C-alpha cells in the first residue's frame, strides 16, 4: 500500500494563489523538502531531484521502488468493509477454520 | 488444559525437566489449541527425541490430525528429523496417512531429499503409488527437485514388484490352459501335461524374485493376480502360439529390468538377470517356435489326425 | 434383395427346396427387413435344421442383431430346439449376447425349461452370473418359474468355482506369510519353511477340485486372486492366530458346500468332499490351535526367546 502525504488546500478558500505558490515554489522543491527533514524526514517524497537527493541512503531508494510498484490506497468508503472483509479471510485462513477459497469468498461478498 | 499450554510452551522450547515436573504434577498430553496443534506436534517440529518419548509414555495421540491434516509424522518427514520419524513408526504412526493436498510423508521425503527417511518409510510399508491432487508421484517430486538416488530407488522397486507379479501372472493362464486340455471334448493328456509343467515353473521364477527382494532389505508388495483371457483356446496350436506370445512379453520386460539395473549402477543385479532369467527366455522360446513349426506343418487345426500323433510323439 | 423376401418367406415356410434353388440362382443371404430380421432369424424361430445349415453355408451372419437385440440364438433358446443352439455355437454365436433387456440365452433357457439347453450353452462358457435390468440372475429366473433342477445345477457348479477360488486365495495368503518371515530383521527360518509348505499344500488343494470338476463334465470358471490383508505380519504368534482364522473359514465353506451337494442328491459329490477335504481341515485347526497355545505359555509375543525356542524345538 503506497501512503502518500499530500497537502490539500480547503475548498472554502479564497486564498488559492498564495498557497500554490507556497506549494509549488517553496514547498516542493530542494530546499523545503531539506528544510523540512532537518527536523523529520519523509522517507521517499513525490519531487523527482529531492528524490535523486535523498535515494543515496538505500532505505529510501527501497521505499520508492516498493512505492512505483505498489497499490495506491483507495480514497473510497468502501475500503472500510474491506479492513473488515479481508481480514476476516486471514482470520479463516491462519486458523484455518475455513480453506483459501473459502475465506476469500467470504471476504468478497 | 491448565497445564496444556504449559506444555506447549516447553514443547516450543525444548525442556525436559519441565515436561518432567508437568508429568510430576500430571499435566494433561492431549492440550488441542484452536487450529489441532498438539504438544506432539511442536516436539516432532522442534526436534527433540525426549519429549517426544516422554508424551508417548503418558499416551499422547500419534495420529492426531490439525485442521491442514498434518500428522507428527509429516512435519517429522518435511524437517528430516530420522530418529523421531522411527520412534513415530514404532509407536504405530500411519505410514500413508494424507493431508488436505493428499501428500504422505514419503512425498514429502522425496520432494526435500532425505533419503534414511525415505529408507525408514518404505520398511514400513509406504505406499509408491500415491498420487496428490496434481496426480504426483513420489518419483515425479524427486525427479523435479534433482534427487536422482531418490528416483532410482523408487523406480527400481517399483519395477521388481511389477515383475513379481507378472511371473505369478503368466503361472495361472498356464493353469488355464492346461485344465482346458483335459475336457471331455478335448482328450489331450500331455499337453495338459505339459502345461502344467510350465505353470509350476513360472511359480518357482516368482519365487526366486521374491527371495532375491528380502535378500537386499527391499519390500516385497503383492498386487491381484488377473484372470486369464480365455478360458476356451481352441486347439494345441492356438495355444502353443499363445503360450508363445506370453513368453515373449516376459522377456521383453525382462530386458527393461535389465536396462534399469544398468543405469542404476547395480552389477549384482544385473548378473542376477543374467544367469537365471535370460537364458531360460531364450530356451523356452526356441522350443516353443519348434513346437508351431512343426504343429503347422503336421496340418494342424484342420488336421485331427495331426494334433493326436503330436501328442503322442513329441509330448509323449 | 430381389430374392431376398424370396429367401424370406421360404425361412417363414420352411422349403428345403425353395432355398436349394435360390442359392442355385445365388440368392443373397443378408437380406434384412426394416426392422432386421434376416433369414437365419425366421430359420432359428421355425426350427428347421437344414435351412439354418445351408445358410452358415452361403455365410450367413450367425450374431445379427435386431432393433429389440435379439440373435438366432436368443430365439433358438426361448422355442427350444436344441440341434440349432448347437449348430450355431458350432459356428461361432457369441453365448453370452445381451438383448434390450441384458437377458442372455441362458436367462431364457432358465426362465422357460430347457435342460439340454442349458447344459450347451454352461459347456461353451455362459455366464452363471449375468444380472438382466432387474438385476436377476439365470438362477433367480429358474427359481421365479419353478425350474428347481435348473437352479440345483447352477447352485452346485457357482459353488464349486467358488471354492476353487478360495483355495487359491488361501496359497498366496502363505506365500505372503512365508517371505514376511526371512526378512533380514525378522530371522526365522523354519517358520518361513512351515508356510511355504502350507502354501504347496492349498495349491494342490485347488487342483485336486479342479481335477473333480473336469471328471463330472462341469465348466471351470477362473477369477481373480486378491492379495492377501497385510504384507506385515507381527510376530509368530499373530501370523499362527491369522492362519487359525483363514481355516476356520476355509472349513466352514466347505461344510456349506457339503450342505448343498446333500439337498441335490449327489453322494458322489459328498464322499469326495468328507473323504479329501473334511478330515484334513480338523487336523490343520487342531496342530495350529497346538502352536498358538504354547507360543502363548512360553511368553510371546513380548518374549524373543520364546519364539527362536519354538522356531528350534517344535518347527526344526
Not at chain 2, 525426549?50 to 507428527?72: H, M, Q, R, S, W
Request: hydrophobic letters at 40%.
Amino acid at each position: 500500500f503506497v501512503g502518500v502525504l499530500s497537502a490539500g488546500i480547503n475548498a472554502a478558500s479564497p486564498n488559492k494563489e498564495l498557497a500554490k505558490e507556497f506549494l509549488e515554489n517553496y514547498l516542493l522543491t530542494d530546499e523545503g523538502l531539506e528544510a523540512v527533514n532537518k527536523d523529520k524526514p519523509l522517507g521517499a517524497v513525490a519531487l523527482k531531484s529531492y528524490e535523486e537527493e535523498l535515494a543515496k541512503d538505500p532505505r529510501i531508494a527501497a521505499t520508492m521502488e516498493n512505492a512505483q510498484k505498489g497499490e495506491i490506497m483507495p480514497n473510497i468508503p468502501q475500503m472500510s468493509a474491506f479492513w473488515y472483509a479481508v481480514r476476516t479471510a486471514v482470520i479463516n485462513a491462519a486458523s484455518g477454520r475455513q480453506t483459501v477459497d473459502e475465506a476469500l469468498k467470504d471476504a468478497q461478498t | 488444559s491448565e497445564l496444556g499450554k504449559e506444555l506447549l510452551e516447553a514443547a516450543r522450547a525444548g525442556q525436559d525437566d519441565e515436561v518432567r515436573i508437568l508429568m510430576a504434577r500430571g499435566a494433561e498430553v492431549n492440550a488441542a489449541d484452536n487450529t489441532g496443534t498438539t504438544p506432539l506436534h511442536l516436539a516432532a517440529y522442534s526436534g527433540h527425541l525426549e519429549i517426544v518419548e516422554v508424551l508417548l509414555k503418558y499416551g499422547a495421540e500419534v495420529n492426531a490430525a490439525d485442521v491442514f491434516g498434518y500428522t507428527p509424522l509429516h512435519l517429522a518427514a518435511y524437517w528430516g528429523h530420522l530418529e523421531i520419524v522411527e520412534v513415530l513408526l514404532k509407536n504405530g504412526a500411519d505410514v500413508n496417512a494424507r493431508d488436505s493436498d493428499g501428500m504422505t510423508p514419503l512425498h514429502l521425503a522425496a520432494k526435500w531429499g532425505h533419503l534414511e527417511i525415505v529408507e525408514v518409510l518404505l520398511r514400513y510399508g509406504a505406499d509408491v503409488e500415491a498420487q496428490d491432487k496434481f496426480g504426483k508421484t513420489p518419483f515425479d517430486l524427486a525427479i523435479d527437485n534433482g534427487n536422482e538416488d531418490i528416483a532410482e530407488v523408487l523406480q527400481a522397486l517399483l519395477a521388481i514388484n511389477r515383475q513379481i507379479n507378472l511371473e505369478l501372472y503368466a503361472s495361472y493362464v498356464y493353469l488355464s490352459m492346461s485344465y482346458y486340455f483335459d475336457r471331455d471334448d478335448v482328450a489331450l493328456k500331455n499337453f495338459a501335461k505339459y502345461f502344467l509343467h510350465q505353470s509350476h515353473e513360472e511359480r518357482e521364477h516368482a519365487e526366486k524374485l521374491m527371495k532375491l527382494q528380502n535378500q537386499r532389505g527391499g519390500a516385497i508388495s503383492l498386487q491381484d493376480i488377473k484372470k486369464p483371457d480365455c478360458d476356451d483356446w481352441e486347439s494345441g496350436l492356438n495355444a502353443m502360439e499363445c503360450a508363445l506370445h506370453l513368453e515373449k512379453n516376459v522377456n521383453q520386460s525382462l530386458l527393461e529390468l535389465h536396462k534399469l539395473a544398468t543405469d542404476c549402477n547395480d552389477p549384482h543385479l544385473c548378473d542376477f538377470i543374467e544367469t537365471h532369467y535370460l537364458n531360460e527366455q531364450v530356451k523356452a522360446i526356441k522350443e516353443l517356435g519348434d513346437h508351431v513349426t512343426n504343429l503347422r506343418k503336421m496340418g494342424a487345426p484342420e488336421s485331427g489326425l495331426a494334433e493326436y500323433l503330436f501328442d503322442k510323439h513329441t509330448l509323449g
